[PDB]
RNA sequence: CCUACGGGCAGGCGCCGAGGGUAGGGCCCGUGACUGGGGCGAAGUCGUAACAAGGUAGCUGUACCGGAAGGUGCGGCUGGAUC
RNA sequence: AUGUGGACCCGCCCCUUGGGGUGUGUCCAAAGGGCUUUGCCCGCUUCCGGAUGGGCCCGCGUCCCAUCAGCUAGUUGGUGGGGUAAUGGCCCACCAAGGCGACGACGGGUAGCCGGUCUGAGAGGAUGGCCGGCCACAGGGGCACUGAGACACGGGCCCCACUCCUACGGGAGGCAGCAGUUAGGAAUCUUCCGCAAUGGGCGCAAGCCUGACGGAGCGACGCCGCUUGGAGGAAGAAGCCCUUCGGGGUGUAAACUCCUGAACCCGGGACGAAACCCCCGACGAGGGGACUGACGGUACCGGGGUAAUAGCGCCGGCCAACUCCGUGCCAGCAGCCGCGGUAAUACGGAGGGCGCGAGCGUUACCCGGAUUCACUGGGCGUAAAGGGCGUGUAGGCGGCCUGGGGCGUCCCAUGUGAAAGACCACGGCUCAACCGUGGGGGAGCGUGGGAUACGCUCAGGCUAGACGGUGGGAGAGGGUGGUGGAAUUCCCGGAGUAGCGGUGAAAUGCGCAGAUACCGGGAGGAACGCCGAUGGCGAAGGCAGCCACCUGGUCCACCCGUGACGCUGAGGCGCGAAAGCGUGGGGAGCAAACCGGAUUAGAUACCCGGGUAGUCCACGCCCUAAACGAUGCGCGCUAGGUCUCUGGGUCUCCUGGGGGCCGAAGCUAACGCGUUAAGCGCGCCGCCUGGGGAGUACGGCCGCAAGGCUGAAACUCAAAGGAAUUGACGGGGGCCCGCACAAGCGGUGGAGC
């Protein structure tokens, strides 16, 4: 635009949208698990994939991805909540902190094993 | 109307150029004038002179070029191959002396009109002075 | 009440006054019987509108009609193929 | 009472907002205490000056929403008061009718501001946590008192809410001081030591107070520094992993050999502290003297001395690092692309490898990349994007010559830009981190001086822009009235007879109340064939028989006039195809809806037959569009050729205005554009900022209604797009083949086998 109109109107600072209502940016809320449930993946993929329906103390209810081998998660939990869609899995928009509150860690993991939170085993080491 | 003369002129010359016209006129004024010496003293053109087209005053403007080239397209090198308004009726362009730019590390000039008359940016900068940066040329 | 008789103090009235009440306006959130569409989700149903002249060229403003895509009127466009 | 002085009224000088001075008149001072006691020490009074700190005012600067457009009645100004330290509608009486607003008032949202910080090549973007500066607050709301200073965190009053006491009458309380507890939360410390230092209050001093402060405690929370050893050490142990079974890897890595010696033990042991005070001198200068350490038995120095912690992420591509097993669209991974369906470098484990290392990863947030809001630095013919077109307000921009002013602009000098932080030196802790000293920058703003090219401004001039005059032109530009012929329908008459109509084929339909076809007459409605164009006119929409009247634009020639009078144009105002609406006419033909006939699996369609609105006129609405050149307006500049409409000339040819085609330079993603630019430039406007949700919701405006203008968000995708390429396909085209069909002769399908 002219440089008349530049000074008539300027140019407009683009706002950002956040991906995540852990609500105030908060880089993990705390939850209650309410259903367990299991879910397909869509779009190419096929699995059984397991998820959390979580009661924030943000006050949203919200859905919640299990990572990790196989877990330990029933209907009165209690979770960490992070952050973290899941991408196959419309409307899950965050994954749950493995080692925190009643979610235990992956079990037999020797690689990855921070996220998962697992602590170090014992044989040769 | 014409808002820019002084673009007038440069786009004239910008033009001719570019089709390694022998000459152009462009509309005469005093300030334009000032330009073209400048312009011809830096060798950017042949030279100047006034002139009556339907007996109105003119500066027919001698350009200039390289050599004819070798392979296809023998096309003469441009001795003006950039020109260019900066100050324009829309935005005029100031600036202070510790701010006239070095324009292709000074294989090229501006242009610049000052208190002082206007100048290079070599003969501005030396004679300590700023004004209106009215174009760059390399 | 005190007084050096000048006045002072108590006290009383009044204006303003946080806040309260009543009637009328506005605005912001909640929650909601009942209701309208929307997104998204390998393999459900009806047709086949569109893409090749898509088998009625298409698209379009508008107006009516119709399970549905749509069809028709009028006017426009070519961003229509065939000579 | 004294009055050095000061205050007030009046006057007079000087000065200029209430600043100095001066003359009558009036009015105003004081406090004592200590002595190593006649002369000192602490104080007291009035006045002037300084220093510090503040109050008030002003220019400029300081976020989002215009889906907040009008706001104001102490409002705006005035006269006179009150109040203050002081100006002021700060408050009050009276008077006037004012003040503010698209340069964004009013309203709503959000937020303490700054020095700085983070980021970035910079411009910019984000930010205001530590430290310093200012503001504001002290459970919520008001208020004043005291005082130099408060409307006062640990003062007072009242109202409100909550907690505690209560003999039910009444009271008490205020950690956003230091610790600390509890609640909330993903998450944030000790109810520590000390006044030794620095600083602060009172005190003649000694001292007293000081959760300011100096320290220590706790958290890899961050930054910096350091350790987990060093040198030898095999053609190379074992174990584990590959393997083409030969070999390869981990790997000098280990074991082992020398060497050093974090931790830990022994010893010494700080700097920070010289003043206050006392003595000499004089209670001054100077000199002498004594006390004082929380940190801390710490830092640091010296002697001895043990081989003494390693983890986390990653290895498909972006990206540094590959193999075996397990697994089989499962379990799972996943930042994006995407991995997984039996040979997966992508899942899980192993070996091996890469990267960082007392850390490594994760999530969250800011800037970056993102030239993806583009000032630097982008775009709008077909990708998102030119407003449907005009008229024109505010605004932006402005041809050539001369002179004046010097607002912009440039220059010099000067004040300011605190400290910290930032940059560079040199120093202090063994280094660094941290810190001391010094230097150097630094936008912006103030004052004084100067320049005058360009911009602005004032005055003067010009004629190239613009407008005008004279004469000549082409045109479906517009409005009103009139008028012409062809055709369709209907009505009347004649003649005429069995069908007409309609389709792929039909039927519905019309026809013996005589249709169709044919001639003659009449009515009406609507539209103008040839001319007609690849044509013309209009700003767009859009305009077509002929005539007249009224009227808009525009082109050429003369170069006569005015003298920059110009361009663009938010908003406003007007125009604005069709359909649609209102009132009233009109209605031939056509024809949404609708009533029928076909077709079809069905056919709410395509085809046929009917047919109302409507299509027509007037007046008033509506205001949209593939309102398209999908191309904003104006101006200058940059080869030509060719065809066309319309002027002028010396009429072979030249010169204007307009419409096309091919094409220089050039531009373009390409297609294409190309003196009718999409080329090169200037000015001004409008618009875009991934797709879907959605031109939806909400709000406002408009509309009789239909609806129109303005126009989101949640959620969700990794595309959505444009142009061009190769194919493939077509119920596209052209050319052509084959026992492909046609032309033939014999078969199969029937029967038995
Ligand atoms: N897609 C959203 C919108 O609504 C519709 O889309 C939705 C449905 O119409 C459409 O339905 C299709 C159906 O038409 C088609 N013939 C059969 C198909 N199974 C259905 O599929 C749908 O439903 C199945 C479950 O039955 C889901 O697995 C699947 O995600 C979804 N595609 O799938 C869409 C799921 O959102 C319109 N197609 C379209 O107008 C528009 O895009
Ligand atoms: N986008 C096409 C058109 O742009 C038109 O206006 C623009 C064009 O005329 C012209 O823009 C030119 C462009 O033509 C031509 N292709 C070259 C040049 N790069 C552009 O220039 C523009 O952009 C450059 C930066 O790229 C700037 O530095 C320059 O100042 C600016 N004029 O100048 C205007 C600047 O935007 C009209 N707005 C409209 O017709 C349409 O939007
Ligand atoms: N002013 C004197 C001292 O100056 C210092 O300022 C200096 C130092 O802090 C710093 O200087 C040193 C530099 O001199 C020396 N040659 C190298 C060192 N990297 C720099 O240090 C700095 O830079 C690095 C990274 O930027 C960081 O560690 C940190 O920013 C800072 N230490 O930058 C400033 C100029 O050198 C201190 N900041 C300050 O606290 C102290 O007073
Ligand atoms: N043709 C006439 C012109 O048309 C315009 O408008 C007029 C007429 O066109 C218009 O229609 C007239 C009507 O006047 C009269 N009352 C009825 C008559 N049938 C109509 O006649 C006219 O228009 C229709 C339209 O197809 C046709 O008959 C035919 O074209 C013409 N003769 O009505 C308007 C006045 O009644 C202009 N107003 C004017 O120049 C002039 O009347
Ligand atoms: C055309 C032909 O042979 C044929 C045969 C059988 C049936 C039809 N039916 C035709 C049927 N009369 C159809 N009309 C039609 O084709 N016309 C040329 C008038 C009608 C609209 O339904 C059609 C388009 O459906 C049709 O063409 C079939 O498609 C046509
Ligand atoms: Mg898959
Ligand atoms: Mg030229
Ligand atoms: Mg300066
Ligand atoms: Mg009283
Ligand atoms: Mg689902
Ligand atoms: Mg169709
Ligand atoms: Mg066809
Ligand atoms: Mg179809
Ligand atoms: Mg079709
Ligand atoms: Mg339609
Ligand atoms: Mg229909
Ligand atoms: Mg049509
Ligand atoms: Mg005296
Ligand atoms: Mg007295
Ligand atoms: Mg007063
Ligand atoms: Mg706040
Ligand atoms: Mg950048
Ligand atoms: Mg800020
Ligand atoms: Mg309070
Ligand atoms: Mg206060
Ligand atoms: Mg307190
Ligand atoms: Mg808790
Ligand atoms: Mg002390
Ligand atoms: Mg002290
Ligand atoms: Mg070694
Ligand atoms: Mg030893
Ligand atoms: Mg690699
Ligand atoms: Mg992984
Ligand atoms: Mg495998
Ligand atoms: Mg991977
Ligand atoms: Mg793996
Ligand atoms: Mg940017
Ligand atoms: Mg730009
Ligand atoms: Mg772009
Ligand atoms: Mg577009
Ligand atoms: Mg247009
Ligand atoms: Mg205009
Ligand atoms: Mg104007
Ligand atoms: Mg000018
Ligand atoms: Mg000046
Ligand atoms: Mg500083
Ligand atoms: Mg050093
Ligand atoms: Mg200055
Ligand atoms: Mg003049
Ligand atoms: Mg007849
Ligand atoms: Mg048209
Ligand atoms: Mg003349
Ligand atoms: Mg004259
Ligand atoms: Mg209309
Ligand atoms: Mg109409
Ligand atoms: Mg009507
Ligand atoms: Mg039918
Ligand atoms: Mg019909
Ligand atoms: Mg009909
Ligand atoms: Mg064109
Ligand atoms: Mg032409
Ligand atoms: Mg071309
Ligand atoms: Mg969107
Ligand atoms: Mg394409
Ligand atoms: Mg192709
Ligand atoms: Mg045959
Ligand atoms: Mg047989």
Redesign the pocket.
Known sequence: ??????????????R???????L????????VCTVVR?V???????????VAKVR???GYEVTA?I?????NLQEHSVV?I??????????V?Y?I?RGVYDAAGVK?????????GT??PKE?? | ????????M???I???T??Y?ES?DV????????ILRILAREGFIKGYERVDV????YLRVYLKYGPRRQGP?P?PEQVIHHI??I??????V??????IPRVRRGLGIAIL??????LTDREARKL?????L?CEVW
Request: net charge positive.
């Open positions: 635009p002219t440089i008349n109109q530049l000074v008539r109107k300027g140019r407009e600072k683009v950002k949208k956040s991906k995540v209502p852990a105030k940016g908060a880089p993990f809320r705390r939850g299991t397909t993946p869509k779009k190419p993929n096929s699995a059984l994939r397991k924030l103390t943000s991805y990572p990790g081998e196989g877990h960490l992070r952050g973290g869609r899941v991408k196959d899995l419309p409307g928009r994954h902190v037999d993991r020797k690689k990855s094993r921070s996220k998962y602590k170090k040769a080491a | 109307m014409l808002t820019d003369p002084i673009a007038d440069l786009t004239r910008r033009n001719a570019r089709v016209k152009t509309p005469a004024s005093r300030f334009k004038e000032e339907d007996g109105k005053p397209d096309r260019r308004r100050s324009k009726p829309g935005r005029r100031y600036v202070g002396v510790k701010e009109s000052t208190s002082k008359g206007v300590g002075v700023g004004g209106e009215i």
